[PDB]
Design a protein around this ligand. Sequence first.
Ligand SMILES: [Mg+2]
Ligand SMILES: [Mg+2]
Ligand SMILES: [Mg+2]
Ligand SMILES: [Mg+2]
Ligand SMILES: [Mg+2]
Ligand SMILES: [Mg+2]
Ligand SMILES: [Mg+2]
Ligand SMILES: [Mg+2]
Ligand SMILES: [Mg+2]
Ligand SMILES: [Mg+2]
Ligand SMILES: [Mg+2]
Lengths: 136, 190, 106, 197, 172
Amino acid sequence: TDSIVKASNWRLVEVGRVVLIKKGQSAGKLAAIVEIIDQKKVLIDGPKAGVPRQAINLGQVVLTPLTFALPRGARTATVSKKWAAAAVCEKWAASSWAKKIAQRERRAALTDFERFQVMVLRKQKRYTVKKALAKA
Amino acid sequence: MKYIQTEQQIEVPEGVTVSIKSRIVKVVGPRGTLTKNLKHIDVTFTKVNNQLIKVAVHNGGRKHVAALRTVKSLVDNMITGVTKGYKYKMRYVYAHFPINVNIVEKDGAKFIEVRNFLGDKKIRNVPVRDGVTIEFSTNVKDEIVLSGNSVEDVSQNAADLQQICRVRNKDIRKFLDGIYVSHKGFITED
Amino acid sequence: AESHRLYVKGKHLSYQRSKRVNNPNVSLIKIEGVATPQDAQFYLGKRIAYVYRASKEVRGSKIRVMWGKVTRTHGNSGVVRATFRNNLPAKTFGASVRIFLYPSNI
Amino acid sequence: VEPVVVIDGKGHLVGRLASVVAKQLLNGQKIVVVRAEELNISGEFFRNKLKYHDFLRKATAFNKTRGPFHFRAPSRIFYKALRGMVSHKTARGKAALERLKVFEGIPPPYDKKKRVVVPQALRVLRLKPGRKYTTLGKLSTSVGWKYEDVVAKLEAKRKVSSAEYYAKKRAFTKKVASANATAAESDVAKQLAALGY
Amino acid sequence: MAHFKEYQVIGRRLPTESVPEPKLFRMRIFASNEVIAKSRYWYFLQKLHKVKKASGEIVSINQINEAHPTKVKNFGVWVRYDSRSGTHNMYKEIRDVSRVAAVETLYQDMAARHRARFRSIHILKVAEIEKTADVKRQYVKQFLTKDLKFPLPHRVQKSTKTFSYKRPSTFY
RNA sequence: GCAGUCAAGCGUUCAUAGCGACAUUGCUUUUUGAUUCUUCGAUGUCGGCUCUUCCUAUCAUACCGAAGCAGAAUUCGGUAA
RNA sequence: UUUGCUCCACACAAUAUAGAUGGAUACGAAUAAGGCGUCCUUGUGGCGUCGCUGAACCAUAGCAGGCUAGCAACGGUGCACUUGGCGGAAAGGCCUUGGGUGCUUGCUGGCGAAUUGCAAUGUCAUUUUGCGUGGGGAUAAAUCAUUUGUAUACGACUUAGA
Ligand SMILES: [Mg+2]
Ligand SMILES: [Mg+2]
Ligand SMILES: [Mg+2]
Ligand SMILES: [Mg+2]
Ligand SMILES: [Mg+2]
Ligand SMILES: [Mg+2]
Ligand SMILES: [Mg+2]
Ligand SMILES: [Mg+2]
Ligand SMILES: [Mg+2]
Ligand SMILES: [Mg+2]
Ligand SMILES: [Mg+2]
C-alpha cells in the first residue's frame, strides 16, 4: 500500500557542487561552483588545485558527486577555507573515478621494463586464479 | 523562454498506490487498476510523502511545460477513475423514428446495436471497449450509461456511439437526431 | 610471442586532391591510433612501406615493397601526408601500409 | 581495429550512420550492419512516409523497369542511403560496397558476435529530446515490405537464446570476479596495483 | 570579437586660432581592437557633433578592464537597432561577469533573435542593475531565486572513437 | 484567363450565406501582343483520325464542411486526377 | 570405354590477392534512466556499488621462439580421436564427456644463437587451380536428327520412340 516512484539521481548545478574541468588550461582539476550565471554558464573557483576563479561553460565541466557547503558568490579565500574544511580532495581521491584517472595515468607512465613486469606478474596471478577457479 | 524548473502536484488519496517506473504509471485503487505509458513527454516524477507526487520539467520550453499539466491531469484522471470511477450518460434524441439501442453479443465482442436511426434498415454497431460497462437507465427515458475506470475508454466509447449516429445529406440543425453526451461524472460521487 | 610487429598500421586513404584534381605524388595516410596533428607529429619522417605481393619472383621473393616516408600532417584528425619513391598505385586506396618506428628519436 | 565491424543499427539515424559507414568502407574497413529495421529517421512517420512516396512517384516514364528501383526493405533503404555517400559508379566504390552487408535482424554468424554502436549516429545522443522520429521497420511496412512479422518472430527467438547465453555468462563472470577478488591482497596483486593493473 | 574590449576614446576637434583648447568629447566603445574603436568613435561623433576625422583628432584611447571580472552581475542594456523595416529601441538584461562578455552576449542575442548585424546596432547603455527587484526580465529573474539548483538531464558525452562497444547512457 | 487583401454597399434586418464598387497584391503560359536568341548546304507548315501519358485550375463519381441547408433541388468550399 | 569421374590426406608447381600481420571480445531494454552484487514479503522491491568511454578485457618472455635438467601443481592450452546436447534466418557454428598426446614463462637451472656484417617486407598469410603418390566412392544423361501439335516467323515450347 506504498507508492513507489523512481527518483533519478542527478548531480545538481548548485553552489558548492564540486566539478572536474575536462577541457582547457586546468583540464583534470577540481573546482567548486561558486555562482550560477545562466543555464549553461557558471562561476567556478578551484583555489587548492590551482584553477582560477572564472566564468566557465558547463560543457568544459563534469559535475562530480561531491558537494560541500559553500555560500553563494564566495570569494577565493572563503572557497579555499570551506574546501579544506570539508576535505574535498580526500573525498575525491577515494572515489572509483579518481582511482581510474590515477590508474590510466600510471599505465601511460609505465616504462617498457615495467610493462614486462606487468606481463610476468599477470601470468603469475593468472596461474593462481585459474587454479582456484577449477577448485571453486 | 526555457523555464528553469516547473512543478505540478499530483495528490494521491488513501487506498491508492501510484507506482511509477521509468515513465509507466500504475495506479491501483479500490475500483481496480490503470496503467499509462507516459514515455513521450520527458518529465521527472518524484514521490514526496506517499500522499503527494511532484512531476517536473527541467529546462523546458513553452510547448514542453504545456505537457506537464497535461501529465498531471492524466495521472489525476487515473486516480479519480480508480477512486470514484467515471460515468458518462447519453440521451437519445429523435423527432419521429424511435432509436432502438440494445447491447448484442457477436462471437464474444459486446457490441451496442442501434436500429431505426432515422428509419434506417442499417444496424449501427459500436463495440464496447474493455473496462466500459453499459447499462440503460430505468426511470430516465432514453438514457444509456457508460461507466468504467478509464475516462479515455469511457469517453471514447461514448463518442463512438455518438459518431455512429450522424445525419447525412440533411440539415443537421433540423435533423437533430442522435445519441449525445448529456452528463460526465463519477460512479460514487456525492 | 604471437606478435612480432615493429610498425604501426596505417591505411592509404587517397592522393592529395582538390575537389576535382588529384596529386598522385603526395599520398594521405591514416595512421592507427592517431587522432590529432600533435599526435601525428611523432610520425613525421618515419618510413612507410606498402608491402604487397606478386606472382613473378624477381629477387627470390614473391613479395614486393613500395618505400616512402611521412612528410607532414594533413588536417585536424591525425591524417598525415606521405611521399613514396614511386607513387602508390591508386588501387590501394584503402590498403594497409606499415609505418616503421625508424628513424627514431624516441 | 577489427577484421569486420558488426554495427547494431537499432537507435541510429540513417544518414549519420550511413555517412560513418561509407567513409569506413572507403577507408577499407569491412562492416556488417545488423538490425536495420530499428534504424531511426529524424522527423515524424508521416513526414518520412511522404518523403518515400515522393521517391516512389519517380520512375522512368517509358519503361518503369529501368528507373529508380524503389527498394522497400529497411536494409535496402539504408543501402540506398549509403549509395550516394559512396561513389558507386567507379571500381573503388564497387569495391567499397562489396565490403558492406546490411541485414534485418541479427542473422547467423553475426548473432554470436559482438555488435558495436556508432555514437555520432545514435538518436539518443543526437536528437533533441521531444523531437519526433520514425522507425525504419514501420516505414518499410507502410511502403510495402512484407517481412516485418517474420523478422520480429525470429528476433524474439534470437533474444531468448541470447538471454540464456547471458545468464550463463553472468554466472561465469561472478565466479571469475570472485576468484580475482580473492587473489587481491596478495604480493603479486599488490605489485600489479603498484604498476597500475 | 572573441571577447569584446571596452575602450574609452577621447577626441578633441583640432584646435584653431579662434578656439584653442577644444572640448574633449569622450565615449566608451565596445570593439575588437583600437582600429574599430577609433572608427566607432568617429562614427558616433559624426552623429552627435559637427566633426569628422579630418577636422578632429583622437587624444586618448584606453582599455577599460572590468573592475570585478569575477562577480556575477545583472546588466541592463539599452540598445537601438535597425530592423528590416525601421529603427527600434530595446532594453535587454544580461547576467554575466563582465561588461564585454555581456555585450558579446547581446550581439549574439540580437543577431540570433532579431537578425541584427553589428552595423545595425548601437549600444546606448550598459549599466549594472545594482539591486535585485529592479531586475525586469523573467529569463534573468529565474536565476535570482534563493538556493538555486538545477540538474542537467540527458548528458551527451563526446566520444573520440567512431565505434563504441557499450550502448552509452545519458545519466548525469 | 484565374486567384487574393480591404470593405462603401447589395442581400426583408444583416459588410463577408452568396455577391461586392473605389483601390491594391499576385499566379499561369493553355490566347494575343513584345524580342529576333536557335534554325535559310529541307526541324515537313493547319485541321481531323489513331493512340499513349501527364497536370489540376474537379464537370461527374467517393467522403465531407457551409448556406438566406425543412424535404427535393441547388449554391459556396475541402481532400481528391 | 587411349583407366574416365569424384572425395580425403600429403608433396611439388602455377595462379593470384580492393590488401592477415595477437583476439570480430555475442543479453535485452531504457536514456527525464540503467549495469552489476546482495537480501527478502520476489516487486515498477530494499541496500550497496559502477559509469564520467575499449586509455578496457583477454592474450602477451623462449632459434618467427631450438635442445635439455628439475621444483611446485593437477591447473592452463594446442592437436587429432571420442560421448552427448543445442543451433534452419544465411543453421555449417556453439557448448559439453572421456582418455591419449605435445607444450607450459607458475618457480629454479644448463647449453645454443654471432658473419643477414650499421637498415633494406627480408618472405612465416589464404585463394583458386594442375600434376604426382596412397586410401575410399559412384557407374548417367543432354543435344542434333526422327516424331506430336496443347506450341510456333525462326529459335523456343510441348509430346512420343530401343
Ligand atoms: Mg437537401
Ligand atoms: Mg580520395
Ligand atoms: Mg552486444
Ligand atoms: Mg509489388
Ligand atoms: Mg546550312
Ligand atoms: Mg529533313
Ligand atoms: Mg523530324
Ligand atoms: Mg486541389
Ligand atoms: Mg467539390
Ligand atoms: Mg497522382
Ligand atoms: Mg607461450
